[PDB]
């Protein structure tokens, strides 16, 4: 149960592009089991992971005694592979069903082609679901657009909530960048913050990247960040 201290509902700025996703997520965490399952989808750096673990953290705090499980489709892959090699299929099934009340799986696009794993995940889903265990799945693609995927699994993804994250607008981006700073206990000029939150618009992974890059500079160069200086430092965040 090692979740990220930052990935919480409170450090999530809401905006037209992520509002619905954020509420579904929050709602699911307030009533684990009521809406099974929750499948969040969106492109890179849009809050999937962050949102996914918030459900985790929120539940760890308001439902102290409740087995919460976060995981990457990839680990679900790597763990199975071993289950087969090491020979203990049980240990695996005990770990991902018998001993979980809430199961959060991130980046499911990793299972494309991996029909092997796809099959085992399928049942894990059904057993957890038939016993009211909350399931949440994050994907960089929507159920349909998920290539090389077992229809039965895919149709399992839809029988619940389906929310889509979309990149935020400039106004909302600046707010995210500001809340990003708090979390890093940093600080920047009200003209640098702007320039960054206005030109590092690919995704939020890079937005934070830049905001940290600068902080690292303000660490070494004890002086400070000058708008011009920032632009030199952030070359690879405007045209990668
Ligand atoms: N709505 C948001 N409000 C504030 N910060 C956000 C928001 N969404 C994402 N972030 C920031 O971006 C990072 C998470 O990006 P992430 O969710 O992992 O991208 P992805 O969903 O593509 O994996 C976090 O560290 C967080 O600080
Ligand atoms: Mg992710």
Q: Any idea where the domains of the chain sit in the sequence? A: 1-168, 169-240
CA separation for the pair 190, 192 (Å, rounded): 6
Residues 177, 80 contacting (CB under 8 angstroms): no
3-state secondary structure of 180: helix
Q: How far is CA 153 from CA 18, 96, 105, 143, 181, in A?
A: 26, 17, 14, 9, 40
Q: Whose CA is nearest to atom 23 of ligand 1?
A: 49
Classify 1-168 by CATH class.
Answer: alpha beta
CA angle 175, 181, 186 (to 5 degrees): 150
Helix (H) or strand (E) holding 200: none
Residues 138, 44 contacting (CB under 8 angstroms): no
* Cα Rg, the chain, nearest whole Å: 20
Residues 58, 9 contacting (CB under 8 angstroms): yes
Binding-site residues for Mg(2+), in ranges, read 49
- Phi-psi map region of 18: left, alpha, beta (phi>0 left; psi -120 to 50 alpha): alpha
| Residue 66 structure tokens | 């409740």
Looking at residue 95, the DSSP 8-state letter turns out to be: I
* Resolution (Å) of this entry: 3.0
CATH of 169-240, one of 3.90.1010.20, 3.40.50.720, 1.10.8.60, 3.40.50.11750: 1.10.8.60
Looking at residue 153, the DSSP 8-state letter turns out to be: H
**CA 2 to ligand 1 center in whole angstroms:** 18
Cβ of 6 below 6 Å from ligand 1: yes
Helix (H) or strand (E) holding 219: helix 204-220
Residue with tokens 């949102």: 51
**Ligand nearest to C-alpha 108:** 2
Binding-site residues for ATP, in ranges, read 45, 47-49
The experimental method, as deposited, was: X-ray
Can you list the positions of beta strands (E) in 145-219? 161-164
Largest CA distance in the chain: 60
Looking at residue 215, the DSSP 8-state letter turns out to be: H
User: Among 39, 50, 74, 215, which residue has the most ligand 1 atoms within 8 Å of its CB, making it the best to mutate?
Assistant: 50
Helix (H) or strand (E) holding 105: strand 102-106
| Residue 38 structure tokens | 């929750």
Looking at residue 237, the DSSP 8-state letter turns out to be: G
């Amino acid at each position: 149960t090692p979740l990220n201290p930052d990935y919480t509902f409170e450090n999530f700025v809401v905006g037209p592009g992520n509002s619905f996703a954020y509420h579904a997520a929050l709602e699911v965490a307030k009533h684990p089991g009521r809406y099974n399952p929750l499948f969040i989808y969106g492109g890179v750096g849009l809050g999937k992971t962050h949102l996914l673990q918030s459900i985790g953290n929120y539940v760890v705090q308001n439902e102290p005694d409740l087995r919460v499980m976060y995981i990457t489709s990839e680990k679900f892959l790597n763990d199975l592979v071993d289950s087969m090699k090491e020979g203990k299929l049980n240990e695996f099934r005990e770990k991902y069903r018998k001993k979980v009340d809430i199961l959060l799986i991130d980046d499911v696009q990793f299972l494309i082609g991996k029909t092997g794993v796809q099959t085992e995940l399928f049942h894990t889903f059904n057993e957890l679901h038939d016993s009211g265990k909350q399931i949440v799945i994050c994907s960089d693609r929507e159920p349909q657009k998920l290539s090389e995927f077992q229809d039965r699994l895919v149709s399992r993804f839809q029988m619940g909530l389906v929310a889509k994250l979309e990149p935020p607008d400039e106004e909302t981006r600046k707010s995210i960048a500001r809340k990003m700073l708090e979390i890093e206990h940093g600080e920047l000029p009200e003209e640098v913050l702007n320039f960054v939150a206005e030109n590092v618009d690919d995704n939020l992974r890079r937005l934070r990247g830049a905001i940290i890059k600068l902080l690292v500079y303000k660490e070494t160069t004890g002086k400070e960040v000058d708008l011009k200086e920032a632009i030199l430092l952030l070359k690879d965040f405007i045209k990668p």
